[PDB]
Amino acid sequence: MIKVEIKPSQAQFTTRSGVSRQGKPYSLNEQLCYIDLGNEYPVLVKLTLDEGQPAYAPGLYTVHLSSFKVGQFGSLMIDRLRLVPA
Amino acid sequence: MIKVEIKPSQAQFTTRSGVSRQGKPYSLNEQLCYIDLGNEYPVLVKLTLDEGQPAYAPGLYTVHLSSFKVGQFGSLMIDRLRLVPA
């Protein structure tokens, strides 16, 4: 299991916006977190939240299976990192 | 944890080859597996093995932390899916 931590300083999201190729508006909410990848300290990672989801609260989390998909070359890829409470 | 299974029919690898941009030869070993992504059946996924590693034997496996890296846009990505026995 991947250990992900939202620190107290990471409790908010920011929003970026724009317009798609054929005219539709979009908004993307982004939040930061720390992920332990086995180095001396955890590393900073950007999360893009799904539509209508609040920011994750501070605490410990692991990664949900729905984060992954098979990509166009047949290998596993991350679609969007989706989290669940540890 | 991600459940990965190497079936008896997937016990071998194949090798692709070529030449890099500035003249160096390369060889890549590829093996197939099944990964349970929570749909009605597991899906077929291609693995690229690391240099000097044999094919994984049939059995059950989970994913090692070294499979992941932070990508050039700051989000988590899979580098190469690396496996360990379950």
Contacts of B43 in chain A (CB under 8 A): 70
Contact predicate B14/B49, CB 8 Å:
no
Q: Compare CB distances from B78 to A37, A44, A77 and report the shortest one's residue.
A: A77
- Data resolution in angstroms: 1.8
Experimental method: X-ray
Q: Compute the nearest-CA separation of B35 from chain A (Å).
A: 9
Q: Which residues are registered as beta bridge partners of B34?
A: B5, B44
Instruction: Walk me through the domains of chain A, giving residue ranges and CATH numbers.
Output: 1-86 (2.40.50.140)
Query: Which residues lie closer than 8 Å to B45 by C-beta, 6 or more apart?
Result: A70, A74, A75, A76, B4, B32, B33, B34, B35, B81
Distance, CA of A16 to CA of A27 (rounded, Å): 6
Closest residue in A to B3 (Cα) is A65
- Amino acid at site A54: P
Q: What one-character-per-residue DSSP string does A3-38 give? A: -EEE-GGG---EEEEEE-TTS-EEEEEEEEEEE--S
Yes or no, beta carbons of B37 and A81 under 8 Å apart: no
Q: Compute the nearest-CA separation of B78 from chain A (Å).
A: 6
Distance, CA of A69 to CA of A23 (rounded, Å): 28
Most distant CA atoms of chain B, gap in Å: 46
Chain B residues with CB within 8 Å of chain A CB? 1-2, 35-38, 43-48, 65-66, 68-70, 73-78, 81
Yes or no, beta carbons of A66 and B38 under 8 Å apart: yes
